[PDB]
Structures are given as structure tokens and as C-alpha cells.
Write a protein that binds this ligand. Sequence first.
Ligand code: S3P
Length: 426
Amino acid sequence: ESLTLQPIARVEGTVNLPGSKSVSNRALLLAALARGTTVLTNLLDSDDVRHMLNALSALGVQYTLSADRTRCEVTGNGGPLRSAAALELFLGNAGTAMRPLAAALCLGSNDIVLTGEPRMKERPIGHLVDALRQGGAQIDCLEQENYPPLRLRGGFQGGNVEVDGSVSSQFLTALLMTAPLAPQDTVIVIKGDLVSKPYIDITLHLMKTFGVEVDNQSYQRFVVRGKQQYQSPGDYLVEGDASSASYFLAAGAIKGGTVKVTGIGRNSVQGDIRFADVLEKMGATVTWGDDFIACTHGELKAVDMDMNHIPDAAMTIATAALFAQGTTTLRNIYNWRVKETDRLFAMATELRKVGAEVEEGEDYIRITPPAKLKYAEIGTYNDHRMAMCFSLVALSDTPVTILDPKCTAKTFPDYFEQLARISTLA
Ligand SMILES: O=C(O)C1=C[C@@H](OP(=O)(O)O)[C@@H](O)[C@H](O)C1
């Protein structure tokens, strides 16, 4: 399968964002653990969320979904997830299911195997397993240490644990969400640098919404009290997805017009709202509201920036760089290599097909645009963001052909239709 995008002369309009994947999967897990019934509004319907929903169903969590799957009423367990069956749960390539559920299922005495698609068995989890085992969990890495599939037999108590922060923030997120329900207090010491810190902030905001606070000591040590129970907030509104928003804001920066996205704004908890600051630095004009961000085209110039705070939205800058004057350098993005694909390799390989000169560093990428873009078929590596980032090539005089376009469904099934709604073809 492929989709050819014809050259787009102008983008403009207003995009009502689908729900945030990061918020959706945290809120589903917390609602399943909490006391009380939580009603989630603007939940994302995408593969990653569906895998979380299916796992929760298999684990006995009671919930109802609206016809469109964006409103979900979750009856909380008022305690850890529990199954008497020796289940095997398939989690696709959803890190926000695999990492958080691996930790959550270490509470109690279940016997559950977590697995996923071939790529998920190549994505690291050892830093999380190490910390969980330090706290008493029984875990078997059935194929190789440091990777799924995992057999979880429970027993996490708490105590003094160390988690490496240098590869994924999702390990710390998973520990943070599970620790409050453990029988003992947990003191988490961070080994090394912590990457993707804004996603830790999402986790802490969500936990607070569900009635639990922790002591965050400068992102280097976290004190969590055990013996707690999450408390349903009642209604909870899932923010629009700020990572999905990046494509439309960038499209406005490149080929607007003014493109406005709704469902996020200046006070959102998602770190990817800071992507708009990059577009502003490149020369676009950005306007903020409480519930929108808008971007209007201006002449674009390259940037050289540390992108560790926005690793996903940073991919959008890599293709937006094709439209900027000068060489763009994106630094401190090593963990691109361990995500849906090796995104440093993939981004460099596909950018070169459209004519860019690319230096693929170990943990950075440097992109020098060609004078004129070239037509290419873009491989997408079963990575939603490769498809969505390369859609921006068509904001030029050159079409682009996206291979396997349905991979966008990991987080954004209707991406191309939403892009078409704001596009005027040349
Ligand atoms: O916690 C989250 O919701 C996420 C954390 C990030 O991963 P890393 O912490 O591995 O960078 C991000 O890339 C991912 O898409 C979503």
C-alpha cells in the first residue's frame, strides 16, 4: 500500500485534535487502579490505546466505551490489577502499555506474560526490570535480558531502588505510577541523566489528578509513600495530542496561511507544546490561547538545538528543515534509535531520497536541504511518525509517496484526511 500526496499550494484552517496518546494510556491505567468510576472525555482511538484497553479488559477491568471510542467510563478496581489466569497479553508496539503494565502487574501474585510485535521485542526494558526486581518483583525475561517478552509473577514490595534515566523516561513513569500501591514506601534514585523529563511531568500531573503526590527531588530522587489508593476525579478531560499537533503547526509554518489547533494551549501538561517555540525560532509567527495554538507562515531559517525535551515533535523539525535556509542540527536525541524504529537511521535514509545531505550522528542529526526537492517513495518502518513527518514534503512543488500509510494509526488513524481538510492543492 502507498499514498501519493499531490503538491499543496496552501494550508490554512482549524484542526480539532484527537486525544493525546500519552495522557490517554496513563489515564486509563490510573482509572483502572483507582477507587470510583472515572469518565474520560476525548480519549484517543488509536492502536496504542486499543492495546491498553484490550489488556485492561483481559485483566478484568470493567469499562464502557462510546460508539466513537472517545468517551470511556472506567469502574476502578480500587487496587492492583488481578487475574487468576495465566494470560499472555499482546501489546503491539505500545511503550505506554508495555512499560506501565510491566510495573503494575508486579503488584500482587499474578502470572502474566507481556509481549508484542517483533519490534517491541527489540525495544529495551531492562532498566525497568532491574528496578522492579530490586523492589522484590519476580520477572523472567523469556528470550533475552533487557527486552520483552516478560513473565511477571508479582511480589513488588517497594524499598530503595535505582532506575537508569538515560534510555527512556517510560521506565521511571511506570515505577512512579505503580509505587503508591506497593506495601512499602519506595525511594527511587535516578542513575545518570534523565531523558524526556517532560513526560515525567505528565505522569506526575496525572497522578496528582488521581489523588497521589510524590516528592520529586530535582528529578534525581523520588520519594513515594506506599499503601495508597488512587481516587477517581470523576470527569477527566484528555488533552488533544500535542505531538499530533506538530504536523499541522509545521504545515502552517511552511505553507500557510494560518493553521490553528484546538484542544491544547498555553497551560497544557504535554511537553510537546514547546514545539511551537521552535517554529517561532525558525521564523514563523505563533499565537497562543488557553485552548489553541496557531502558526502562520514566515520565512524559515534553520536552527541548532538540543531536542531532548521534545524527542517526538523534533522529528517534525527534521522534515520542516527541508524548507528552511541553512543547516538544521537536532542534538541529544540518542533514544530515537530505540523507538518504533531506529529513527536516526530511518530519518537520515529517507531525507536523503528527497535530496537532503544528512550527517547521522550517534545522538544527533544534521540536515542540509537541497536547492530543489526530489520525488521519492518514503519507507515508513512501521513508524507512524515517519509517515506524518514525510507528508510535509508535499508542501512544495514535488509530490511525495508514503509507503504503508496506515501505520499512522498507532496514534492518528485519520491523519491524512485531517491534513487534506486544511490543504489546497496546487
Ligand atoms: O511517556 C510517554 O508517554 C512517552 C515518552 C517518550 O519516550 P522516551 O521517554 O523513551 O523518550 C515518547 O517518545 C513516547 O512516544 C511517549
